[PDB]
Amino acid sequence: MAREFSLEKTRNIGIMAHVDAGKTTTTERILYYTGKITITSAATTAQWKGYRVNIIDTPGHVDFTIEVQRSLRVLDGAVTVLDSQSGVEPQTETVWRQATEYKVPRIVFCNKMDKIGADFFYSVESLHDRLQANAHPIQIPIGAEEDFTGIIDLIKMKAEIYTNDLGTDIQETDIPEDYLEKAQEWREKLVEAVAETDEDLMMKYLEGEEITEEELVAGIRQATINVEFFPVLAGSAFKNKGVQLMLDAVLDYLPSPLDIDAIKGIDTKTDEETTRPADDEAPFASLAFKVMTDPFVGRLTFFRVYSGVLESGSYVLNASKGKKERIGRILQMHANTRQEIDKVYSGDIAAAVGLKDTTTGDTLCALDAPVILESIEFPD
Numbered sequence: 234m235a236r237e238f239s240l241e242k243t244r245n246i247g248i249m250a251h252v253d254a255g256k257t258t259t260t261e262r263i264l265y266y267t268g269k270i271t272i273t274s275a276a277t278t279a280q281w282k283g284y285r286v287n288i289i290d291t292p293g294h295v296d297f298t299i300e301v302q303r304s305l306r307v308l309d310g311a312v313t314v315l316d317s318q319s320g321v322e323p324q325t326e327t328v329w330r331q332a333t334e335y336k337v338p339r340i341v342f343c344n345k346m347d348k349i350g351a352d353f354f355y356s357v358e359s360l361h362d363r364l365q366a367n368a369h370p371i372q373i374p375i376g377a378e379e380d381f382t383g384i385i386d387l388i389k390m391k392a393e394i395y396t397n398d399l400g401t402d403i404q405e406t407d408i409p410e411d412y413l414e415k416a417q418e419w420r421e422k423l424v425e426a427v428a429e430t431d432e433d434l435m436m437k438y439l440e441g442e443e444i445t446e447e448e449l450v451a452g453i454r455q456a457t458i459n460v461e462f463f464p465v466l467a468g469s470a471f472k473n474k475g476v477q478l479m480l481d482a483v484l485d486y487l488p489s490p491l492d493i494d495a496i497k498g499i500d501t502k503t504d505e506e507t508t509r510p511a512d513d514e515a516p517f518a519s520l521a522f523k524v525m526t527d528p529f530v531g532r533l534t535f536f537r538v539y540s541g542v543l544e545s546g547s548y549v550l551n552a553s554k555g556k557k558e559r560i561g562r563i564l565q566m567h568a569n570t571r572q573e574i575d576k577v578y579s580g581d582i583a584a585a586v587g588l589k590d591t592t593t594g595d596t597l598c599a600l601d602a603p604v605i606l607e608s609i610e611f612p613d
């Protein structure tokens with residue numbers, strides 16, 4: 234009947250992580266924290282503090298084919314996970330450059346801060362040296378290796394101290410005195426780096442004016458969405474340290490569907506290029522990204538809606554196959570449940586029951602406003 238979560242309050246994300254960086258644990262913990270109400274699902278519908286969060290599956294190994302490019306068009310932003318002991322590795326770099334080519338904003342989670350050899354600053358520096366990435370810490374860890382016990386928020390200049398490995402009984406305190414100057418130092422570097430991404434901010438910073446928290450957070454957000462800045466966080470997913478903070482950063486800095494360039498397509502009627510921006514009033518257009526065989530409802534086809542709205546029990550056009558398709562039931566797969574819905578809006582992800590001739594990469598769109606979307610980048 235009504236759109237539950239607005240476009241502004243939607244986050245379509247992927248987790249970019251090599252198997253050594255702890256992809257599965259991080260994903261499992263994210264699904265746990267965002268699922269409050271082995272088969273890995275193509276996309277999980279979830280929530281975090283009033284925002285819709287859709288976690289989209291991505292490969293744990295380097296993909297040099299076309300399949301990688303497709304998932305990058307479905308997700309809007311990503312969390313890149315690093316093994317704090319190793320920093321950026323060759324495989325990590327390739328994945329990072331692909332994501333930059335396809336303009337995917339990212340926050341970086343330096344995982345395994347409790348492992349022997351874990352070095353947050355080394356990991357941060359490797360982003361600059363090996364990728365020329367404009368990465369800046371928005372946190373500094375309290376301790377390292379078995380002494381890793383907390384995380385300092387550079388924005389608020391407060392600290393979280395963990396008392397267990399469950400993610401409960403978190404003590405919110407002031408920064409310990411032995412880390413205050415170091416925190417001040419890294420916060421100054423952060424302010425300076427953010428100021429360098431915005432002319433109006435740099436003018437104020439150079440003139441010595443006070444940059445507010447709201448202005449600093451907004452600056453980080455805009456630069457991150459522009460793929461010209463990468464906030465760096467720390468934690469241990471397996472020991473439930475820094476997970477909630479990282480999820481907060483997804484909301485704070487990663488893009489909503491309105492923050493991304495509108496998807497391009499070919500209008501088959503005029504034979505010219507067009508776009509399908511996130512607009513519930515515009516004609517329906519979507520991309521299928523995974524075909525699943527579910528052991529309950531049967532053939533499920535996952536899709537991402539870019540424009541318009543789709544009602545369950547309707548007819549749409551598979552513009553890639555050149556034929557009309559019936560959309561029966563529509564489901565959204567949660568971590569612990571499966572919800573049936575009668576309408577999917579722009580920017581959301583869902584799964585249609587029993588679609589006959591639809592495969593990954595196909596455009597599903599309005600019968601009256603046909604378009605072929607750019608799943609694979611158009612030739613030139």
Ligand code: NA
Binds near residue numbers: 305308310337493
């Ligand atoms: Na994208």
